[PDB]
Amino acid sequence: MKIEEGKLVIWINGDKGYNGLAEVGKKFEKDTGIKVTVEHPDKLEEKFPQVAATGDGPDIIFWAHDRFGGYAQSGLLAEITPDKAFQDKLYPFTWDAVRYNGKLIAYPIAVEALSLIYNKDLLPNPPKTWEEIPALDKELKAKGKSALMFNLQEPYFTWPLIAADGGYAFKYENGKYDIKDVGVDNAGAKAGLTFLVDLIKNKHMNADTDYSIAEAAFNKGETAMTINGPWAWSNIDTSKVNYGVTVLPTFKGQPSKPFVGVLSAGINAASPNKELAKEFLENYLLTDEGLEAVNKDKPLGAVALKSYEEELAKDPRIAATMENAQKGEIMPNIPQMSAFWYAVRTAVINAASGRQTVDEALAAAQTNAAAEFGSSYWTSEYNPNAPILVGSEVAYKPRRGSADGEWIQCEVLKVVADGTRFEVRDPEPDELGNSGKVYKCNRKELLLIPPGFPTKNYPPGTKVLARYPETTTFYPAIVIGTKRDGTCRLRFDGEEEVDKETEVTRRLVLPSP
Ligand SMILES: OC[C@H]1O[C@H](O[C@H]2[C@H](O)[C@@H](O)[C@@H](O)O[C@@H]2CO)[C@H](O)[C@@H](O)[C@@H]1O
Ligand SMILES: N=C(N)c1ccc(CO)cc1
Ligand code: NA
Ligand code: NA
Ligand code: NA
Ligand code: NA
Ligand code: NA
Numbered sequence: 189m190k191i192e193e194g195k196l197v198i199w200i201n202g203d204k205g206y207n208g209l210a211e212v213g214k215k216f217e218k219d220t221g222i223k224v225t226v227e228h229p230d231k232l233e234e235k236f237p238q239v240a241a242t243g244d245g246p247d248i249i250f251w252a253h254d255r256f257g258g259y260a261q262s263g264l265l266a267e268i269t270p271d272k273a274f275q276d277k278l279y280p281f282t283w284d285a286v287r288y289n290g291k292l293i294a295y296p297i298a299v300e301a302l303s304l305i306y307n308k309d310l311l312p313n314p315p316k317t318w319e320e321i322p323a324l325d326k327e328l329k330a331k332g333k334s335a336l337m338f339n340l341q342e343p344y345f346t347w348p349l350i351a352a353d354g355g356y357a358f359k360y361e362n363g364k365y366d367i368k369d370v371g372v373d374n375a376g377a378k379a380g381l382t383f384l385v386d387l388i389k390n391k392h393m394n395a396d397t398d399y400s401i402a403e404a405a406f407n408k409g410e411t412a413m414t415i416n417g418p419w420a421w422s423n424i425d426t427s428k429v430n431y432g433v434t435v436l437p438t439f440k441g442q443p444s445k446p447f448v449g450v451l452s453a454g455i456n457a458a459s460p461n462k463e464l465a466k467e468f469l470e471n472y473l474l475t476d477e478g479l480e481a482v483n484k485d486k487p488l489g490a491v492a493l494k495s496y497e498e499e500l501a502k503d504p505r506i507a508a509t510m511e512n513a514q515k516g517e518i519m520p521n522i523p524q525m526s527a528f529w530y531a532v533r534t535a536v537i538n539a540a541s542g543r544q545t546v547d548e549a550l551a552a553a554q555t556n557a558a559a560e561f562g563s564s565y566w567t568s569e570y571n572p573n574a575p576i577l578v579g580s581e582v583a584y585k586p587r588r589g590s591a592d593g594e595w596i597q598c599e600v601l602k603v604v605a606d607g608t609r610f611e612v613r614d615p616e617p618d619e620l621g622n623s624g625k626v627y628k629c630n631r632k633e634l635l636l637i638p639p640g641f642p643t644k645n646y647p648p649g650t651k652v653l654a655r656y657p658e659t660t661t662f663y664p665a666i667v668i669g670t671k672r673d674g675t676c677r678l679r680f681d682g683e684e685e686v687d688k689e690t691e692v693t694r695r696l697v698l699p700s701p
Contacts, residue, residue, distance in 0.1 A: 200250035208485030252449030257521030294452040298488035301513035338415035343532040348444035373554035395540035418489035562607035568699035
């Protein structure tokens with residue numbers, strides 16, 4: 189039998205109520221005699237398909253519904269079978285969010301939408317518009333505070349601003365999303381991102397601000413505002429900050445349009461515990477008592493279960509959540525959402541860092557929003573391993589090339605075999621002295637070179653592969669330190685005598701497999 193049989197393993201993101209979920213798990217254990225294990229792995233959304241593809245992984249996976257169409261398409265999610273009476277318990281619109289190719293592929297849990305969260309003491313009257321934040325910031329800077337801080341590393345948080353004046357993902361036509369009609373590069377999208385970049389250029393925000401930094405700053409009363417979802421309210425409650433939750437600011441007179449997510453629970457198609465998982469989800473979790481346990485740990489938002497949402501509706505923070513939801517748009521769940529999110533993340537981060545102009549960033553995003561891509565077999569906490577698409581720069585290990593653990597900087601010309609194989613062009617001359625040779629390779633023979641300026645520094649001592657200055661070749665090296673600007677001080681283990689120190693751009697320093 190599969191190692192997975194005879195137990196129930198559940199994965200949910202670390203920012204949500206996993207302890208509350210485990211309480212529901214315990215109630216289930218008492219009745220069934222079966223162990224339930226709740227885990228919250230890092231990079232969950234990408235980790236799931238990694239393990240589920242081998243027939244392993246959790247029996248149940250929790251995530252916003254946008255990822256689930258891709259999971260289902262890849263054959264990773266079982267069709268669920270709630271009867272009509274169970275379906276009646278949840279809002280019809282939540283079920284629509286978990287339908288793929290006409291079949292239900294997950295149980296809806298809760299509606300999530302970003303809201304403006306503000307410190308009432310610092311800012312009793314929050315701004316109605318994005319346009320007034322610059323002035324507000326300079327006033328707060330004079331008192332050692334800032335106006336606004338939110339995660340600039342995940343495009344989820346910047347999307348409401350991009351969409352405000354006309355930006356969109358995929359156009360919905362003829363009862364379906366048109367993957368050839370992408371709106372990430374229109375006048376509206378450009379206007380939104382430009383405003384964001386201008387905030388950074390004018391020292392109103394830092395391009396390096398991530399989730400952790402933004403949350404800490406708000407919860408310590410150092411910033412007047414933040415942009416986050418219901419899950420975050422719990423930590424703010426503990427902080428003692430006198431906060432309110434309200435409608436996001438308008439941009440160019442238009443309401444901000446956050447992408448609305450439906451937190452959903454899918455069943456692993458390879459799971460030998462499917463009926464058990466159904467019972468858990470339908471009869472334990474999706475009950476007033478079950479959702480209450482999770483909600484009390486970390487607020488779920490507007491829950492899909494009507495009976496319980498009736499209790500939560502009176503909450504002004506929930507009213508604010510739904511007001512923003514109403515102004516926003518439920519995300520598509522099509523498989524192209526993975527490429528879309530990669531494209532917009534790269535564009536936002538690159539425009540923020542100055543790696544690209546807004547027009548350059550969004551032009552590339554439009555090209556790659558629905559593009560085929562692969563991932564490198566090798567993963568790291570320091571560099572992403574995806575997407576590898578046409579035009580990506582990669583480090584390639586030739587099968588009969590240079591012997592000293594060296595890789596060549598190549599360009600991806602083609603993604604084939606369902607993203608599992610690549611054609612890459614070698615700028616260096618082959619054994620016949622001819623440069624520009626195209627090679628076919630698998631996922632283990634290449635590493636993704638970041639298309640931007642990585643924010644994550646290597647700790648001293650880290651073993652790396654770095655391009656030698658003036659060359660297009662990667663050599664083994666150790667990280668000695670990191671300059672203030674992020675440049676890596678390296679010691680190439682290459683020469684035969686002295687420990688020199690060579691500076692190399694962080695983008696060209698890769699984690700050794
Ligand atoms: O940023 C791109 C990202 O956005 C969404 O992920 C959200 C998630 O839905 C929230 O519940 C919370 O965990 O924050 C995430 C962003 O950091 C999409 O669901 C996801 O697919 C997408 O990659
Ligand atoms: N809790 C409610 N008010 C509720 C309303 C409507 C329905 C669907 O008829 C279920 C529940
Ligand atoms: Na994500
Ligand atoms: Na939108
Ligand atoms: Na207005
Ligand atoms: Na039953
Ligand atoms: Na090394």
